[PDB]
Every structure is written in structure tokens, then in C-alpha cells.
Write an enzyme that holds these catalytic residues in place. Structure first.
Site, PDB file in Angstrom:
ATOM      1  CD  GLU A  71      -1.476   0.108   3.507  1.00  0.00           C
ATOM      2  OE1 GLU A  71      -2.076   1.217   3.451  1.00  0.00           O
ATOM      3  OE2 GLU A  71      -1.847  -0.861   4.158  1.00  0.00           O
ATOM      4  CG  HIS A 100     -10.113   4.945   4.580  1.00  0.00           C
ATOM      5  ND1 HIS A 100     -10.313   6.286   4.945  1.00  0.00           N
ATOM      6  CD2 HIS A 100      -8.875   4.566   5.053  1.00  0.00           C
ATOM      7  CE1 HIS A 100      -9.251   6.673   5.635  1.00  0.00           C
ATOM      8  NE2 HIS A 100      -8.385   5.685   5.693  1.00  0.00           N
TER       9      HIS A 100
END
Length: 108
Positions: A71, A100
Site C-alpha cells: 500500500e 479506505h
């Protein structure tokens, strides 16, 4: 700063690494970052969080043994982190998220 989805994804692909502006949260913590204060820009001017391993707990992302997901924050400039992230694999499949980690879409 290379912090846009297309910038990061083209980059990740031609260099096999994250651009220079990223640091891990642990790194980030070491230089004084406190998530509650939204001070990253203060302690680490012109940087964003990226390169930590995304655990893919809920199998939403293509699984494979030998495959590690990672990420990185997208479109960050200062303040509190946003909801925008890029997810890249060791085999270089790139996904995006804007909610998210709830939904993922293929970008590369």
C-alpha cells in the site's frame, strides 16, 4: 511530487520501486509523526506514507502464494491522511482504492 495514481502506477512499473517521496509509517513515527495531530508535513516535508505490506485479510484482492500486497497513499499534501490508496503486488498488478480499502478496481 509523484503522488498521483497514474504517476505512481507508471513509476512503480518502470522502476519497480516507489518514488522518493514515500516513507513507511514506522519511519514516519521515528521522525515525530503523530496520526492524531495530522502533522506529517511538519516532520517530513513533501512526503507521504507508502510501502507497508497490506495484509489482504478479507481476500478482496487477488490471492496467490508468493504474492505480497503493498500500500501507498495517493494525492496527499498536508494534514490528516485521505482515503486514497494504491495497492501493488510483487508481481506488479496495481489496484486503487478511494474508500479506505472497501472497494478495489484494477488500474494496471
Amino acid at each position: 511530487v509523484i503522488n498521483t495514481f497514474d504517476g505512481v502506477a507508471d513509476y512503480l512499473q518502470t522502476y519497480h520501486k516507489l518514488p522518493d517521496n514515500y516513507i513507511t509509517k514506522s519511519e514516519a513515527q521515528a521522525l515525530g509523526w503523530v496520526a492524531s495531530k495530522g502533522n506529517l508535513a511538519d516532520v517530513a516535508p513533501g512526503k507521504s506514507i507508502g510501502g507497508d505490506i497490506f495484509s489482504n485479510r478479507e481476500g478482496k484482492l487477488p490471492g496467490k502464494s508468493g504474492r505480497t500486497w503493498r500500500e501507498a497513499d495517493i494525492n496527499y499534501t498536508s494534514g490528516f491522511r485521505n482515503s486514497d490508496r494504491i495497492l501493488y503486488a510483487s508481481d506488479w498488478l496495481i489496484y486503487k482504492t478511494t474508500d479506505h480499502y472497501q472497494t478495489f478496481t484494477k488500474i494496471r
